[PDB]
C-alpha cells in the first residue's frame, strides 16, 4: 500500500544514477545540491550522473562522535539546480517499520520497487573489514550486489542500501540531523 506511491515520488524527483570506478548505483538528491551515496562508491571528483559527467564541489564521508564510519557520504554538486527538498522526510530517530519499500533506480535496475516489509534496527556491521554503525536490515531474498538504494515508508525516507547476503538486505540509516 502507501509506502509504495510514496517512493515513486521521492525517486520520481530526487533519484538519480551514478556510475563511479566501483559500480553503478542510485544517488539521492536531499536539498540545494547536496546528494547522498552510498561510502562504497568512492565517487571522485567528476561523478558520472545518469551517464553525463557532473563536477563535485564538495564530499563528506560521515562518521559518528567516535568516528565509527556510517556508510555515506554526502556530495555538493556544481549545478545550478537545486534538489527538491526533501530534509523533512528524512528519519527523526524512527527507524523500525513494520512496512519498508527498497526503491533501487540504477541503469541495470530502472525502478525497481520491493516491498521488504519489516525494517529491525542491527547496529553494527562489519562492512568489508570497516566496523558502520546505524545500521538497518531487512529481507530480501535475492542478488543485486552494490547497487545502492532508498529505504522508505510511507512519508519517512529510511536509509540507503549499502547490499545484501542472498536473504537480507542492509541500510545506512539516513537521519535528518546528518543535514543539519
Known amino acids: 500500500g502507501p509506502a509504495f506511491e510514496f517512493a515513486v515520488a521521492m525517486m520520481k524527483r530526487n533519484s538519480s544514477t551514478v556510475k563511479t570506478e566501483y559500480g553503478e548505483f542510485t544517488m539521492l538528491g536531499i536539498y540545494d545540491k ?62 523500525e517499520v513494520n512496512e519498508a519499500v527498497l526503491a533501487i533506480n540504477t541503469s541495470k535496475f530502472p525502478n525497481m520497487y520491493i516491498p521488504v516489509g519489516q525494517v529491525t534496527d542491527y547496529g553494527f556491521l562489519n562492512l568489508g573489514g570497516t566496523p558502520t554503525k546505524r545500521m538497518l536490515m531487512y529481507n530480501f531474498p535475492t542478488r543485486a550486489g552494490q547497487c545502492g538504494g532508498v529505504l522508505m515508508s510511507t512519508g519517512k525516507v529510511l536509509g540507503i542500501h549499502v547490499g545484501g547476503n542472498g536473504h537480507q538486505g542492509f541500510s545506512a540509516a539516513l537521519l535528518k540531523h546528518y543535514f543539519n
Do not use: C, Y
Open 34 to 95: 547536496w546528494a547522498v551515496l552510498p561510502r562504497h562508491a568512492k565517487p571522485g571528483p567528476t561523478i558520472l550522473m545518469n551517464d553525463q559527467e557532473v563536477s563535485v564541489l564538495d564530499a563528506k564521508e560521515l562518521v559518528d562522535k567516535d568516528g565509527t564510519n556510517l556508510e555515506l557520504t554526502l556530495l555538493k554538486l556544481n549545478r545550478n539546480e537545486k534538489f527538491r527538498d526533501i530534509r523533512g522526510f528524512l528519519a527523526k530517530e524512527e527507524v
